[PDB]
Design a protein around this ligand. Structure first.
Ligand SMILES: [Zn+2]
Lengths: 191, 135, 99, 261, 66, 326, 173, 137
């Protein structure tokens, strides 16, 4: 695939798996079984009948916002060999192919340097896109938007912490009753 | 600020295409009514009063409006052409070539069946189309 | 026109209902897109609406069942609060008697 | 030669009784598929059926039961025990006088062997999954957990308290089919009831309706060896001989009147 | 009835989309109707639905009956 | 002895956790396990000596077993000592790796140090009787039996019909066939026949029985698999378990005129028969469809190592006139 | 306050028991009705599944409250792996479409609906599943009390085992 | 402190390591019941959030709340363990936990492995077996 500074406007006709191309690009960031459309075995992630699912991503840092240009090379070669068995091999090369890293955690570091899938608004599946654009009425539009704004998840963790604070209050009550009993014995032993 | 800027960007995109309105974001009912006053319409009626292609474009504009204030420098989109219109696809490509051309920060993984990236006006600076070898 | 007698659509809707026919209901009439929606419909809701396509008396029965469940939860929390209140009041009244 | 001669005479009595063989056949079939206790009535019933088919007059029931017990000891080192009646629980080996009957495994440990079994099953589970043996193993495991619960509950814990403790260990009280077992815990409970592992107590308090607690059922109780229980707990926490008698008495406390001792 | 309930008979369409006139002598037994569109088979379904108190939006090809 | 008696007890107990069927070598490991529990171990014995006393105990056992209408037989697994021991040392590797956490004793070191001599033998305590309590297995209802018997019949049919085509090298059976062929002849590129047969197919027809819901079906299958009555191929096919075999071995032998091995004269449902149809032709003196002569895999190996490479029923070029048997 | 509580408690308990009795009667009504519903629906649809020569079941789920109850599908063809649930996650759409076909067949089996119409749903389906749909129509002709059947297809395939009660059509457009 | 990607991601990283260390103190408390872990994790997360003050990415708030919930449970459990020097409730988890070797709240593999093994090793019920000859008819 040919890309660069310009975005990933994949012009993929029928038979190329345009949605499948999107899923492969997403799996370039470590999708799971329910977000890969390939199941337990990774053979179909590779070409059907192939083994070496090569994700090669030369990432040049000769522009604004360079990540370790003198360390990770001006270019960065993300090499994800997704295979039929075992964990997929990784190699984060420099411009000259010098493998600076061999894991996607440094990819995570680079992305956090760039913010460049977790948010539904970030990445939308075929089912998710269909629900957003056709199966979304005002209530469903609201749910889709709040999830994309994470506002749904925001309030989720909000009231989750609220619930654990209620738990904390219950602990306050019980442990304070225990403290009252202990201090009552304390004062009685004083007198 | 997100709701405000989302309504503003929705109105701006509709004006670029032609339109204006408000978002009834009823938290209690968890319902986002979208009452948009359009030239194609009469009053600030809901987007459900618009055409299917018009409703799809309105949803796309609202989604980009949602993207606008979010701290996301990466977005994706696929499998939308099946339940949309080619006019909407072309207008979206124009919106990308007029907005994402200067958005050198957000990585947009947008997937289209046709080679509309180079057929239509979506290539520009910042982030835009790049060659995908058709099968 | 029923037997070539001009009427509105309501009488024909009554006829369709009385003919055991539903050109709207997916259980009797749906499209491929409606088929896939069916393939994504809420199992709870989809089953319920199929039942409605068979029986809705039991549907309202279930609805009242859930409503009574909610009433039960409300009244149950009320009973718990009443029990705790009774016990606390008994203890406090003992204290008042002592005073 | 004690075993040889004894088994020889056993074989002789067999010449007087193939009935015992068929009996244990049914015994072990019923158990293996069911893990079951059997009633005195059922015993004598099948006995009379056999006596008719054998066309031989019925000998002593006590005779028969003792004979087969000895059989399956010399062949199996086990004891057939009958149970005292449930009426004796809420209001010399009786044998022929006892009512409910099962088989008991009469050997001590062979420590290294049980641990090596632990090891084999460790290979098993680690390979297993992100079953009927293992299915029942989980079934019994939850059982044992609950047993411990009741023991810290001094042979008395209500329904809902138990329910909470189940949630305490991540058990879905939602009513879903049990993971791996595809059933409801309620059905498990009804099993322990029929498998006499538990006691369900329902009392009509006029304020709160029927309140239900539970106690240890005599299947477990006869099952539950004291030292077995104790060293079991030691192995739960990987304990040395130091806290032996101290936790022994702590367990005595946890028991109380748990057993009709 | 002698036939199964709701047995359809020949349906006459007139001045419909392109069909100035046509009549289909239908079948009470079975209908393995195979063939793509081009004259409005989906439009034929819309005609059948709308002519029997059915909203055309069940499929959504054309809405206004007139 | 009482020591030996209780030994044999514990053996059978394992057998119950073995649910009635136990490996030769696994039994050996249990022996060493027991001798560590008994602390009576005398290091000076070759594995053979342990085997000796094992079998002495075995005989005492089966003496009483025969008293009981139940009995343990020792057989050799048809996939053969080598393939058996390959899969078993794949787990003896998982075993010694797991025991290194427990290898705090020289006994455990000796255990991991004793590389298991290759052996495919198992011992099985099996019914010898058919009477009321017998049918009173109480395992489950009647349909489950009848249908399972039907599936067994299906597998019998599958075994009888020879399928021609390339050998499934995915089957390790073929791999070891070729390995033996190379070991004996040294012909690294010897031509393989395309004639083969097996029973394992029919899982598709498990789902072709229509008298019960699919759920119950699957679940019963899971029982069996746990109960190791049938077995799952990684291709999804199912055969019937070796011990389960010995049971039905004798019954089916009666029911279907089942020819045994030629050297050990035991029925084997896997091995090598003659691909010459004249060897599988009916022996016209009997009028019975005479399935082609087939040895146990070890029996075939010994025969070819010592007797011939030609059939005896037909004499054919067993190098080319063979059939793989799965 | 205690007087108020003790006055309300008998009334509240009475209402709770009225509830409980109503719930019990509702169970005793629906649960057997739903039992027949699901049982015979699944029987018909799965017998058709086997007529296809394919693995597929539809299970009813009844958690503690009726609001939690539902219906699911669990199918299998790939013998290499055991059966699992059939949903809209990863399976082929044609399998789900055929499942819906059997769904409407069982609906005819149960509902008063005396005839069948299939409106070109087979769009995008492969050869195998469309042949399966055709054979489903055949079995519709193979059932008793021959009603009116309609199925709209764009094309037709070979190897169509036919019978007498059926009537093959051809939509021209 | 309003929008530095480095600050946000380092907060993420410190919090993830904090999660790992809190899982360690999870087992520590399960065996013992220490409150210092809870309080110190509270202080750590609060300090990091103080650094996040002015930074406004949702995920940080979500994960911080996760930390909050975990720490609150830590403190409550430690207090319960502090009040007196139950034990089975401690033990069964420990039994479950010690049957939790894993690499280092659903139901684990060797959880049930150990439990069933224990019962077998100890059951006074003798094991049982079955067969098919006779059901084979
Ligand atoms: Zn021959």
């Amino acid at each position: 695939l040919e890309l660069g500074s310009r975005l990933n406007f994949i012009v993929g006709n029928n038979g190329s798996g345009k949605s499948a191309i999107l899923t492969a690009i997403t799996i370039g960031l470590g999708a799971k079984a329910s977000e890969t459309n390939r199941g337990s075995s990774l053979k179909d992630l590779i070409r059907e009948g192939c083994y070496s699912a090569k994700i090669i991503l030369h990432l040049d840092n000769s522009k604004y916002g360079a990540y370790q240009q003198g360390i990770f090379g001006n270019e960065i070669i993300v090499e994800r060999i997704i295979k039929r068995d075992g964990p997929a091999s990784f190699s984060l090369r420099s411009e000259n192919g010098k493998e600076i890293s061999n894991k996607k955690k440094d990819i995570q570091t680079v992305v956090d340097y760039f913010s460049v899938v977790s948010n539904p608004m970030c990445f939308l599946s075929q089912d998710a896109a269909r629900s957003f654009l056709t199966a979304s009425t005002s209530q469903d539009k609201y749910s889709h938007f709040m999830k994309g704004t994470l506002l749904q998840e925001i309030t989720e963790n909000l009231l989750y912490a609220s619930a654990i604070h209620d738990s904390a209050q219950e602990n306050m009550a019980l442990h304070l009753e225990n403290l009252k009993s202990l201090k009552a014995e304390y004062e009685d032993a004083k007198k | 600020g997100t709701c405000f800027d989302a309504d503003m960007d929705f109105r701006a995109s509709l004006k670029v295409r032609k339109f204006s309105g408000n978002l009834s974001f009823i938290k209690d009912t968890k319902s986002l009514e979208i009452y948009i006053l359009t030239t194609n319409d009469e009053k600030a009626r809901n987007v459900d009063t618009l055409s299917g292609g018009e409703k799809s474009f309105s949803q796309m504009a609202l989604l980009l409006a949602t993207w606008k204030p979010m701290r996301s420098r990466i977005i994706a989109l696929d499998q939308f052409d099946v339940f949309m219109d080619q006019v909407n696809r072309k207008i979206g490509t124009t919106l990308i070539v007029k907005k994402l051309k200067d958005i050198a920060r957000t990585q947009t993984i947008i997937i289209t069946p046709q080679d509309i990236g180079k057929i239509a006006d979506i290539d520009s600076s910042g982030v835009s189309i790049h060659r995908m070898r058709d099968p | 026109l029923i037997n070539d007698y001009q009427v509105s659509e309501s009488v024909v809707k009554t006829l369709v209902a009385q003919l055991n026919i539903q050109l709207d209901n997916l259980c009797q009439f749906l499209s491929q897109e409606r088929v896939e929606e069916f393939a994504r419909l809420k199992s709870v809701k989809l089953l319920v609406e199929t039942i409605r396509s068979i029986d809705a008396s039991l549907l309202d029965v279930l609805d009242e069942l859930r409503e009574l469940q909610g009433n039960e939860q409300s009244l149950q929390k009320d009973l718990d609060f009443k029990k705790a209140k009774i016990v606390h009041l008994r203890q406090e009244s003992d204290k008042l008697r002592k005073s | 030669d004690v075993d040889l001669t004894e088994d020889l005479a056993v074989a002789k009595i067999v010449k007087e009784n193939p009935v015992a063989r068929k009996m244990v056949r049914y015994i072990l079939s019923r158990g293996e598929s069911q893990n079951s206790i059997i009633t005195r009535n059922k015993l004598q019933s099948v006995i009379h059926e056999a006596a008719r088919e054998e066309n031989i007059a019925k000998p002593s029931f006590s005779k028969m039961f003792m004979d087969i017990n000895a059989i399956l000891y010399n062949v199996y080192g086990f004891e057939l025990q009958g149970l005292p009646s449930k009426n004796n629980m809420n209001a010399e080996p009786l044998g022929h006088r006892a009512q409910k009957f099962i088989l008991l495994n009469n050997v001590p440990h062979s420590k290294n062997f049980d641990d090596f079994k632990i090891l084999q099953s460790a290979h098993t589970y680690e390979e297993l999954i992100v079953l009927s043996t293992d299915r029942d193993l989980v079934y019994k495991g939850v059982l044992s957990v609950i047993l411990c619960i009741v023991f810290f509950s001094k042979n008395n814990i209500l329904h809902q308290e138990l329910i909470k403790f189940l949630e305490t260990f991540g058990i879905p009280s939602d009513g879903s089919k049990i993971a791996i077992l595809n059933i409801t815990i309620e059905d498990l409970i009804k099993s322990l009831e029929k498998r006499e592992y538990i006691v369900r107590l329902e009392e009509k308090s006029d304020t709160d309706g029927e309140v239900i607690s539970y106690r240890i059922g005599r299947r477990t109780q006869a099952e539950l060896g004291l030292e077995s229980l104790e060293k079991l707990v030691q192995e739960i926490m990987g304990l040395e001989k130091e806290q032996t008698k101290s936790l022994h008495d702590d367990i005595i406390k946890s028991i109380g009147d748990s057993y009709s001792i | 009835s002698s036939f199964q309930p709701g047995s359809i008979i020949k349906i006459r369409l007139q001045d419909f989309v392109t069909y100035t006139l046509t009549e289909f002598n239908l079948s009470p037994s079975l209908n393995m109707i195979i063939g793509p569109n081009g004259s409005g088979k989906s439009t034929f379904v819309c005609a059948v639905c709308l002519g029997l108190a059915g909203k055309p939006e069940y499929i959504g090809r054309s809405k206004k009956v007139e | 002895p009482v020591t030996g008696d209780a030994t044999a007890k514990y053996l059978l107990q394992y057998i119950l956790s073995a649910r009635g069927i136990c490996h030769e070598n696994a039994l050996i490991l249990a022996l060493m396990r027991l001798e560590t529990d008994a602390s009576t171990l005398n290091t000076e014995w070759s594995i053979q000596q342990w085997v000796d006393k094992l079998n002495d105990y075995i005989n005492a056992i089966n003496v009483k077993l025969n008293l009981l209408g139940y009995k343990i037989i020792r057989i050799n697994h048809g996939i053969g000592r080598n393939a058996v021991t390959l899969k078993a040392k794949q787990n003896f590797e998982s075993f010694e790796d797991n025991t290194a956490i427990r290898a705090h004793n020289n006994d455990y070191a000796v255990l991991q140090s004793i590389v298991l001599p290759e052996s495919n033998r198992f011992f099985v305590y099996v019914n010898l009787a058919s009477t009321e309590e017998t049918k009173l297995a109480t395992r489950f209802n009647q349909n489950e039996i009848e249908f399972m018997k039907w599936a067994i019949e299906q597998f019998m049919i599958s075994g009888e019909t020879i399928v021609e085509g390339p050998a499934l090298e995915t089957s390790i059976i073929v791999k070891e066939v070729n390995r033996i062929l190379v070991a004996a002849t040294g012909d690294s590129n010897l031509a393989k026949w395309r004639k083969f047969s097996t029973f394992t197919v029919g899982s598709t027809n498990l789902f072709q029985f229509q008298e019960l819901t699919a759920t119950d079906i699957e679940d019963l299958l899971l029982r069996l698999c746990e109960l190791k009555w049938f077995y799952r191929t990684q291709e999804g096919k199912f055969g019937i378990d070796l011990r389960c075999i010995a049971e039905l071995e004798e019954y089916l032998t009666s029911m279907y005129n089942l020819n045994t091995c030629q050297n050990c004269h035991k029925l084997a449902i896997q091995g090598v028969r003659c691909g010459n149809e004249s060897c599988r032709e009916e022996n016209e003196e009997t009028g019975e469809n005479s399935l082609s002569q087939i040895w146990h895999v070890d029996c075939f190996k010994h025969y070819i190592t010592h007797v011939s490479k030609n059939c005896d029923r037909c004499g054919s070029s067993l190098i080319t006139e063979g059939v793989y048997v799965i | 306050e205690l007087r108020e509580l003790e006055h309300t408690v008998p009334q509240q308990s009475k209402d709770l028991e009225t509830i409980k009795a109503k719930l019990k009667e509702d169970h005793a009504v629906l649960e057997p009705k739903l039992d027949d519903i699901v049982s015979k629906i699944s029987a018909r649809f799965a017998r058709l599944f086997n007529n296809v020569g394919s693995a597929g079941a539809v299970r009813l789920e009844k958690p503690k409250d009726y609001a939690e109850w539902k219906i699911e599908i669990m199918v299998k063809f790939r013998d290499n792996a055991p059966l699992k649930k059939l949903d809209s996650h990863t399976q082929s759409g044609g399998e789900r479409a055929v499942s819906t076909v059997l769904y409407m067949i069982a609906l005819q089996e149960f509902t008063s609906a005396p005839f069948r119409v299939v409106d070109q749903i087979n769009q995008g389906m492969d050869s195998r599943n469309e042949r399966i749909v055709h054979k489903a129509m055949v079995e519709n002709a193979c059932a008793e009390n021959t009603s009116q059947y309609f199925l709209i297809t764009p094309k037709l395939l070979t190897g169509l085992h036919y019978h007498e009660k059926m009537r093959i059509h051809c939509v021209m457009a | 402190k309003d929008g530095d990607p480095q600050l946000e991601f380092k907060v993420l990283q410190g919090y993830r390591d904090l999660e790992s260390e809190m899982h360690k103190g999870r087992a520590q408390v399960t065996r013992t019941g220490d409150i210092g872990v809870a309080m110190d994790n509270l202080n750590a997360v609060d300090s990091l959030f103080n650094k996040v003050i002015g930074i406004k990415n949702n995920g940080l708030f979500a994960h911080d709340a996760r930390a909050m919930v975990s720490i609150s449970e830590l403190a409550q459990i430690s207090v319960r363990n502090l009040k007196f020097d139950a034990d089975e409730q401690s033990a069964a988890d420990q039994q479950e936990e010690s049957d939790g070797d894993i690499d280092r709240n659903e139901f684990s593999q060797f959880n049930w492995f150990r439990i069933g093994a224990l019962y077998n090793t100890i059951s006074k019920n003798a094991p049982i077996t079955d067969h098919l000859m006779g059901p084979l008819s």
